[PDB]
Amino acid sequence: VLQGTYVDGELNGPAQEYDTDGRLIFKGQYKDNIRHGVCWIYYPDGGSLVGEVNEDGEMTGEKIAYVYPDERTALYGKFIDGEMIEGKLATLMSTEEGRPHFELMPGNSVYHFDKSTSSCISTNALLPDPYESERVYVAESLISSAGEGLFSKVAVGPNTVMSFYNGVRITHQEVDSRDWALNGNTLSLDEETVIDVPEPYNHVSKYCASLGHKANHSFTPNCIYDMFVHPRFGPIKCIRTLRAVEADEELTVAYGY
């Protein structure tokens, strides 16, 4: 559903778009039937993309931003048609009138869209996700037979995205062909895809771009796997709290597949 102001057979002025479940997914304005000015695109997971659109109404420019679900942490910079070419870490300081004002964080790390393949998990296996690194850490699990576990660095309420589950993308068939010892870290993304963190990447000294594969299974979990559109990893899953969680609590999830 689209709701917009129309002047002379054409959309002109404020407009909002909802998806089937009724979630607001876009807020902006149109000019001559084309999106115009500063527009906001919201993803079901709470993340968003904001910036002045180009003349074809596309999220293309040098001052576009992807904003994480805390509505504060952002990756600011060059995007073409919504795909991040080069984003730098920043903080959304305020939104006077329609527009966001960003403050860059110190540092030289730049981020870009880097969806994985069957073989390659990442062009920067050791560049941590900035939003996740402030929320969780890996340490020895309190489940005895488990080994390492994922813990919260801070206290947060229900429905909070804490970690991302990225990995190589392979087929359900390949996973169901050879077996068990190699399937420790597989998660079904969709009917056609399975995400896996194999080989040497299962260890944080070798891969720490995302840490979701570290959460252990539990039958009374405090988190859940959820779909997530990430500006660097693409369509993946994230780990979201099911209830309030205190600082240093182990995060556990129900079986995915």
Domain extent at residue 21? 1-113
Q: How far is CA 178 from CA 115, 172, 181, 188, in A?
A: 25, 11, 9, 16
Q: What is the dihedral of CA 170, 176, 182, 188, to 10 degrees?
A: 50
End-to-end CA, the chain? 32
Could you please report the per-residue DSSP string of 21-70? T--EEEEEEEETTEEEEEEEEE-TTS-EEEEE--TTS-S-EEEEEEE-TT
The span from the CA of 221 to the CA of 99, in Å, is: 39
Q: What is the dihedral of CA 23, 56, 47, 254, to 10 degrees?
A: 70
How many helices (H) and strands (E) the chain has is answered by 2, 20
The domain tally of the chain equals 2
Taking a C-beta distance cutoff of 8 angstroms, is the pair 65, 50 a contact? Answer: yes
**CA nearest 92: which of 75, 110, 112?**
75
Taking a C-beta distance cutoff of 8 angstroms, is the pair 80, 65 a contact? Answer: no
Report the alpha-carbon angle 26-80-167, nearest 5.
85
Taking a C-beta distance cutoff of 8 angstroms, is the pair 53, 39 a contact? Answer: yes
Same structural domain, 45 and 63: yes
Which method, experimentally, gave rise to this model? Answer: X-ray
| 189: Cβ contacts below 8 Å, ≥ 6 apart | 169, 195, 235, 236, 237
**CA nearest 196: which of 208, 187, 209, 205?**
187
For the annotated binding site for S-adenosyl-L-methionine, the residues are: 146-148, 216-217
The span from the CA of 223 to the CA of 160, in Å, is: 9
The span from the CA of 4 to the CA of 2, in Å, is: 6
For the annotated binding site, the residues are: 146-148, 216-217
Same structural domain, 97 and 136: no
Q: What would the two tokens of residue 185 be?
A: 């870290």
Same structural domain, 44 and 76: yes
Amino acid identity, position 39: C
Q: Which is it for strands 168-170 and 193-196: parallel, antiparallel or unpaired?
A: antiparallel
Chain center to CA of 169: 16
Q: Which of 113, 134, 154 is the last residue of a domain?
A: 113
Same structural domain, 83 and 154: no
Same structural domain, 101 and 153: no
Same structural domain, 164 and 89: no
Q: What would the two tokens of residue 7 be?
A: 């002047």
The span from the CA of 212 to the CA of 197, in Å, is: 10
Q: What is the DSSP letter of 105?
A: P
Same structural domain, 36 and 98: yes
Model resolution, angstroms: 2.3
Taking a C-beta distance cutoff of 8 angstroms, is the pair 127, 155 a contact? Answer: no
Catalytic residue annotation: 165, 213, 217, 225, 255
Same structural domain, 122 and 196: yes
The span from the CA of 96 to the CA of 90, in Å, is: 17
Same structural domain, 103 and 122: no
Q: How far is CA 22 from CA 1, 84, 90, in A?
A: 8, 27, 30
Domain of residue 221, CATH code: 2.170.270.10
Q: What would the two tokens of residue 197 be?
A: 């963190």
